[PDB]
Write a protein that binds this ligand. Sequence first.
Ligand SMILES: CC(C)=CCC/C(C)=C/CSP(=O)(O)OP(=O)(O)O
Ligand SMILES: CC(C)=CCC/C(C)=C/CSP(=O)(O)OP(=O)(O)O
Ligand SMILES: [Mg+2]
Ligand SMILES: [Mg+2]
Ligand SMILES: [Mg+2]
Ligand SMILES: [Mg+2]
Lengths: 317, 317
Amino acid sequence: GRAVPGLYHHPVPEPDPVRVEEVSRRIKRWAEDEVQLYPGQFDGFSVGRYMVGCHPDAPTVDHLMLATRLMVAENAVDDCYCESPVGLGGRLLLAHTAIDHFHSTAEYTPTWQASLAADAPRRAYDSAMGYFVRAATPSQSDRYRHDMARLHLGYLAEGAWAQTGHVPEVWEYLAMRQFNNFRPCPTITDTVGGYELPADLHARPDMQRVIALAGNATTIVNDLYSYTKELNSPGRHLNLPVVIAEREQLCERDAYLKAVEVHNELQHSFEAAAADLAEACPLPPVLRFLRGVAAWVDGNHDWHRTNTYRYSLPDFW
Amino acid sequence: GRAVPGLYHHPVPEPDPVRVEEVSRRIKRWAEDEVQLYPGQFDGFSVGRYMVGCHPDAPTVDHLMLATRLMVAENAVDDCYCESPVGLGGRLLLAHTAIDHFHSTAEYTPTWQASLAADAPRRAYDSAMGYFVRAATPSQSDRYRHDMARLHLGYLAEGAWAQTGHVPEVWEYLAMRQFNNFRPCPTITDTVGGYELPADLHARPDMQRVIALAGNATTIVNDLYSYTKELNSPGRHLNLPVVIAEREQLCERDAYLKAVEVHNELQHSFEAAAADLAEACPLPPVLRFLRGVAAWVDGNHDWHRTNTYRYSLPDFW
Ligand SMILES: CC(C)=CCC/C(C)=C/CSP(=O)(O)OP(=O)(O)O
Ligand SMILES: CC(C)=CCC/C(C)=C/CSP(=O)(O)OP(=O)(O)O
Ligand SMILES: [Mg+2]
Ligand SMILES: [Mg+2]
Ligand SMILES: [Mg+2]
Ligand SMILES: [Mg+2]
């Protein structure tokens, strides 16, 4: 329950247990009844607290469920596909067509259509994206598809390196982790909050830097909380402390403490860039979106800190 | 110089030789002087005719050069990286950061910055995208990055299959080819034409189907013209006739003729969907963009038909 010592973060209120329970019951029903996700590790309570904590402005549980089904589907892919298969690029492209559809001839379209029911990851993406596309504006859907293309490219860099046991330089690992990253989750904060960050404002270079820094900081949070778990993962699973240690030839402890400082610099930079843009462009949807990304990041730190079933901390302090 | 018999296409005017020559001289200078592309196969005349023919509405050669440097950079990646490396996913993600930049700490940012000069593909993307970002709106830049993420995912499906000599089902091959696809070229037709298709109109589902069908048809054109060349490529290089033949157990000839019919159905569907959207949404930028995608597709068919240095036709008629 303790935060990583020295990790810069902001406390968050206990998530509303009425919403956590309602999310938990509905996501279990979606998993079992609509997409047949499994035949435990899956808990509804875990993801319910996660999403309530990360989206305090959601008007309804229906809004929370848009993010929740997409998070569960993302998990199902990383679980069924990403553990390192040589054939990953083919599997992931076909699953990506549940997110960005295939357009083809009368002959081939139905065969693709049938593939969307073929396994749990595609049933999960097809169904989760279908609820999102109904709720969100076409620009919000397109933005999510781009963030998912980023994430799939991220997985495929990590998998290519794992095929040869390659340890990239630290900045190379960080570049992969900018893509293989929580980013598709905080960037839907506007859809989940029932409003829209207009596309031309999303596309501003300064906003794109804000989003990347937030995703980068909050993904390094996961490196830090999941570091001890990953020591048992197959092969040598990369995370920032492992890569710094191996490339910079540092003991695990000193590498882990430097990773904490890297996280802090990213989090502070995210905050300064967000403050600058809020001043440069104080339109209400921009300010709402920036606050919502911050809330997602703080909520993601809280979930990792409290999830003692998935994570524990190394003995370094 | 002859078109594939039975291939549905539209003739185009001979490209303006004054513009072809000016594009040729400037792209050779960019290649040699700015990005050190090589130490022949590269001709300026080839790509000059290509881009003039595909962008008849470009106001200036500067506009044509925005597309031309990006096409040459795309080629450089496919040439230096894609021929099948196990480490492709890592190489391509790092090159993608020349298109969608890395955001990191004061320590790691400059090391990434130096990597953008490290090889010809990254110097080519960094420089070509830098001219594009200066010219285009932030929404047009963001749209190009998404189309490049699609293309890199496409390469990585093709490379994952090539690692095991896997022949996917035909619709699976077509799904990969929807991504590994000319799409990033016709979708910049508005930037090259000096106007903007507004982002919310680009994101409409019907427009996204139009774009996918156009890219799919015009990419299958390349399968058909490059079929005889690819028979000498390493391994068994996939294209629609090869995949249909191997999965459907047809002789090469009958598979090739069916591929021509598939191309035709995609091209007709593209046209019908474009006509429907022009009627549904007759705003001038939409109608300009649809005409510009059509011109790119017709120009791409013409370039393949006339490029007897890269391509020849099989003896099937
Ligand atoms: C879009 C979503 C949910 C995730 C993006 C990929 C991602 C950041 C997964 C969480 S990080 P990962 O190291 O892979 O997972 P853990 O086992 O450490 O929990
Ligand atoms: C964005 C650009 C230029 C290309 C996208 C990838 C693409 C369609 C390359 C042309 S198809 P490809 O079979 O790879 O090349 P060819 O040797 O047949 O000429
Ligand atoms: Mg992972
Ligand atoms: Mg982890
Ligand atoms: Mg290729
Ligand atoms: Mg080809």
